[PDB]
């Protein structure tokens, strides 16, 4: 018998995909222990998701303290030479 949490079934769960997509989008580093619950790391097999902060949009969005020029909120991967 198989349950949604059982190890051979995880790739069929829509939620396992969606939460691994979230984890990649919300991380800043491959250091999972700092950023996620032990429950999340186990339930979503986050060791095997390519989490590194490269997919988080905030890695690329500018957020300077003072904003005279409307530079804040621009995303470098949307520029002409990217």
């Amino acid at each position: 018998m198989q349950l949604r949490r059982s190890p051979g079934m995880r790739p069929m769960d829509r939620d396992w995909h969606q939460e691994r997509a979230r984890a990649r989008e919300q991380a800043y580093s491959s250091d999972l222990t700092s950023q996620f619950s032990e429950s999340e790391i186990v339930k979503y097999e986050l060791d095997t998701a390519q989490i590194d902060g490269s997919d988080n949009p905030r890695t690329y969005i500018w957020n300077r303290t003072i904003d005279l020029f409307g530079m804040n909120g621009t995303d470098v991967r949307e520029l002409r030479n990217r």
């Binding site: 020029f69 409307g70 530079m71 621009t74 520029l79 002409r80």
Partner: protein, 49 residues
């Protein structure tokens, strides 16, 4: 005496407006390529004080 005008985008002066894609700056820029050359410099005399 020849004045030689070259422009890549037309016949004459080209003026271009732009927004900076990042910085909330607008500009206007003009260009023209020009040379001047005597065909025959003997056809010309300066008057001197």
């Amino acid at each position: 005496i020849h004045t030689i005008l070259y422009a890549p985008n037309g016949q004459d002066v080209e003026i271009k407006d732009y927004e900076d894609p990042i910085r909330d700056i607008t500009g206007v820029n003009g260009r023209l390529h020009v040379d001047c050359q005597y065909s025959q410099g003997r056809s010309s005399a300066t008057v001197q004080y």
